[PDB]
Structure 1
Amino acid sequence: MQIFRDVSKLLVERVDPKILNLFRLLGKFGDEVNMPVYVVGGFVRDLLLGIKNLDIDIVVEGNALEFAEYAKRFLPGKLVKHDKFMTASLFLKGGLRIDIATARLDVEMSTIKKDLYRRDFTINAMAIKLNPKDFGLLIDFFGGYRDLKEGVIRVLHTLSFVDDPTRILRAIRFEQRFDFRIEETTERLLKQAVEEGYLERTTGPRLRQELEKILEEKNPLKSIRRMAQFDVIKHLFPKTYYTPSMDEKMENLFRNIPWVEENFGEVDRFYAVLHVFLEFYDDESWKEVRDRYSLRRNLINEIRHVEKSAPALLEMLSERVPASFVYPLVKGVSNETICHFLAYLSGEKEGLFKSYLLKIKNTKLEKINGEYLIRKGITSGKIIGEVLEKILMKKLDGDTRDEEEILEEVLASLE
């Protein structure tokens, strides 16, 4: 196919001038220090799709470090060097990070081709040359341009997933972000690497990251679902079986995470999802998952809390009951515990349980009473904190005045 294309006009019309100007300069600096300068990866992809990107990757043929020190000279910002693998990032204003790398060991200067070929999918393996001579040059050896037109996710070569099974995850994320489809050959390859154990063959940490990145997408459920279609989940969490049920939970989970965030703050989605994936895990199967990925040791208790009390919750919800009855179930629990509870309901029940949650957040108001009256009268320890709890509940449902309710339960519990 056409391998070279002029996207210079495309550049000036779609690229904000502060940024287009930075390209013209990087290109000239490249020429001044005698190195080919390319912008590569995601920006090239998004540019052709009309998507904005402010995370731009430069590849030079030469020395990133040199090239980047030479650039700092003429550009305002902070330079971070990473010597071990000649690489660098220049930090510019307005969320704008410019990363520079050195391409390793087809006119000739086509060593970018060896750089491009090492990448994951064709839409992500294209390059735009920035040196003034060839300023707008779209370099596309692998048919990523057409693959953008035809909405196709495609690996560069047969051994792609075997080299990095982490791309199994990447393929699905991108195919779900853009509504593309993983082409036949890649799908056979993807399926095969999953089936054979390639994921189980890759480190927890890299899997976790690729997982988190999915959870930072617009619609993670899409990807989780697609994963389930490719048996990927079974192989990440060996005791998790993604059934109509789990998936119904996952949908509720995702529906309610906003509403939670809005009222309780940051939700760590990786933990929120694990609450679902991991329900009903035996003790042993839990340690292995908790060790493969690094999972806060108390998690399995928190999950076990939700999976144990869920029918009771459901039950209380039907039969609308006194808020004080559900309090013990949401006591001092993570936003993920709350999310996990919400995973279990929809419609009327859902909102109903919402209102309880609010009633609990907001009505923690013990107000006038402040623990003084308690150790003013005689008290020690645990009793202090049990009278304080009985006062608390009485409020949630109705109310008394200041402390009739206090002497109500020191003389009701006195019995």
Structure 2
Amino acid sequence: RKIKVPENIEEIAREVGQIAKEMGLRAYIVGGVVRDILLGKEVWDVDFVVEGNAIELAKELARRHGVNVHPFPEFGTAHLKIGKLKLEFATARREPASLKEDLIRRDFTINAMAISVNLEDYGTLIDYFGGLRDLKDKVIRVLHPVSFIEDPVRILRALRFAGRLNFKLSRSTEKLLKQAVNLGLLKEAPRGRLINEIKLALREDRFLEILELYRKYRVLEEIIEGFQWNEKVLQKLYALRKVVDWHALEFSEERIDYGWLYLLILISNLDYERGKHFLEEMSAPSWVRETYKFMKFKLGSLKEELKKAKENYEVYRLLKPLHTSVLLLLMLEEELKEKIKLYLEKLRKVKGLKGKELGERIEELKREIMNK
């Protein structure tokens, strides 16, 4: 089968094939980028695999376009940018290696396809492992049965792609995933790589769906010491999605990385020290780490103070110093939700004295307006 290369990639794809021929090599667009092209997505980050010296191919392309190139000899890879296109060139490897050997070592069939950019078969979809069929059938399938033993981080990755795409695990892939979890393989996997994969998941639009898969396959219990699911936490996550969707819609210029809020709710029953340590392990942003500390130490008192607040100005005074994240967390409390909405939609928009005495009188005049 053949596809047309997307118009924004076509000129470079053609040129890469031409240069490859000049060098006696072959080149291919590979992997997640091919998946995303098949899913009809606009792609600006293009990954190539070269059967041969990828760095020398990249350096020649870069020379012709007058751009900087970043070589990595120990990995046989190079990176460069041409206009809006970010390009990676990698030498085929079996970890000389064939394209097929380079593809069969990847995680799932839908991520293991290639597009030839070579002169004689330009645009050919190279699909050795049933990737197009698994797209059709909406299936996440490993390339070989020992895949999760070989790299248990793929357990988490499988669930990220399943949740992102609303795909199911293949029947055997599901058995393999459950068996790897049960055997303890996830618990023993390289910590840093597991953490990196959770960081990727929390960026996903469908993070909540991914978390439901995490729950189904009992993965977080293997990773976060002392973590347990319960119905309260689960229901809070669904309540949070409604709040986040509302905030993103109504205040588009004030969006934050909402995925971290789900994480904060997830770990909200951990002891503070372990939660703090986990967020540091995750390299969480300052606002996330501060919101977590606030959640544990101060939010209880604040919820009560906000409840007791009778006039709008008091609500305003209590909410004014808070990061957006704490406001959205407060909206999970049904009795507080409308006070937060009022602050966000109305109260915060209210607009020879010197120094603070000037500020005091301004705050007095504000108080009169807000309470009306």
Distance 1:127 1:289, change over 3 A: same
Which residue is 1:134 aligned to? 121
Instruction: Give the distance between the partners of 1:23 and 1:263, measured in 2 at CA.
Output: 36
Q: Does the C-alpha gap of structure 1 residues 43 and 298 become closer, same or farther in structure 2, counting only changes over 3 Å? A: closer
Kindly state the Cα deviation for residue 349 of structure 1 after the two structures are TM-superposed: 5.6
CA distance in 2, matches of 1:306, 1:230: 34
> Which letter maps to 2:26?
P
Q: Which residue matches 2:241? A: 254
The one-letter amino acid paired with 2:31 is G
Percent of aligned pairs sharing the same letter = 33
In 1, Cα distance between equivalents of 2:298 and 2:264: 9
Q: Is the 8 A contact 2:330 2:337 kept in 1?
A: no
Question: What's the CA shift for 1:181?
Answer: 0.9
Question: Which whole-Å CA distance do the structure 2 matches of 1:330 and 1:139 have between them?
Answer: 56
2:371 paired residue number: 398
Relative distance call for 1:332 and 1:235 in structure 2 (3 A) is farther
Q: Which residue of 1 aligns with 2:268?
A: 279
Query: Which runs of structure 2 are paired with 1:15-414 in the superposition (5 Å)?
Result: 15-16=6-7, 18-75=8-65, 77-94=67-84, 96-104=85-93, 111-260=98-247, 262=251, 265-295=254-284, 298-305=290-297, 308-309=300-301, 312=304, 315-316=307-308, 321-327=310-316, 329-345=318-334, 350-363=337-350, 370-371=354-355, 373=357, 391=364, 394-395=367-368, 397-398=370-371
Residues in 2 aligned to 1:246 and 1:138: alpha-carbon distance in whole angstroms = 44
In 2: Cα distance, 1:334 partner to 1:195 partner: 40
Unaligned runs of 5+ in 2: none
Q: How far, CA to CA, are the matches of 2:243 and 2:292 in structure 1? A: 21
User: Would the aligned equivalents of 2:272 and 2:296 in 1 still touch at CA under 8 Å?
Assistant: no
Q: How many residues align?
A: 366
Q: Which runs of 5+ in 1 are unaligned?
A: 1-5, 375-384, 400-415
Name the structure 2 match of 1:408.
none
Contact 2:203 2:257 in 1 (8 A): no
Query: Contact conserved, 2:29 with 2:47, CA < 8 A, in 1?
Result: yes
After superposition, the C-alpha distances for 1:324-345 in whole angstroms (9 at most, x for unaligned) are: 4434653522222222222334
Q: Secondary structure in 1 aligned to 2:220?
A: coil
Q: What is the deviation of 1:203?
A: 4.4
Q: CA RMSD in A?
A: 3.2
Cα 1:282–1:178 change in 2 (3 A) is closer
CA distance in 2, matches of 1:392, 1:205: 53
Of 209-218 and 147-156, deviating more is 209-218
Give yes or no for contact 1:360–1:396 (8 Å, CA) kept in 2: no
Give the distance between the partners of 1:267 and 1:275, measured in 2 at CA: 14
Measure, in 2, the Cα distance between the counterparts of 1:163 and 1:396.
Answer: 65
- On the 8 A contact 1:214/1:223 being kept in 2, the answer is yes
Change (3 A) 1:333 1:180: same
* CA distance 1:241–1:323, shift in 2 (3 Å): farther
In the superposition, relative to structure 1, how do residues 299 and 50 fare at CA in structure 2: closer, same or farther (>3 Å)? closer
Given the two structures, how large is their TM-score scaled by the length of structure 1? 0.77
Q: Return the TM-score normalized by structure 2.
A: 0.85
Distance apart, 1:267 and its partner CA: 1.7
Q: Which amino acid aligns with 1:11?
A: K
Q: Deviations over 1:245-291 (max 9, x none)?
A: 21221122222235545278342334322321122322443354245
Q: Which has the larger radius of gyration?
A: 1
| 8 Å Cα contact 1:77/1:93 also seen in 2 | no
What is the CA–CA distance in structure 2 between the aligned matches of 1:221 and 1:310, rounded to whole Å?
27
Moved over 6 A (4+): 387-390
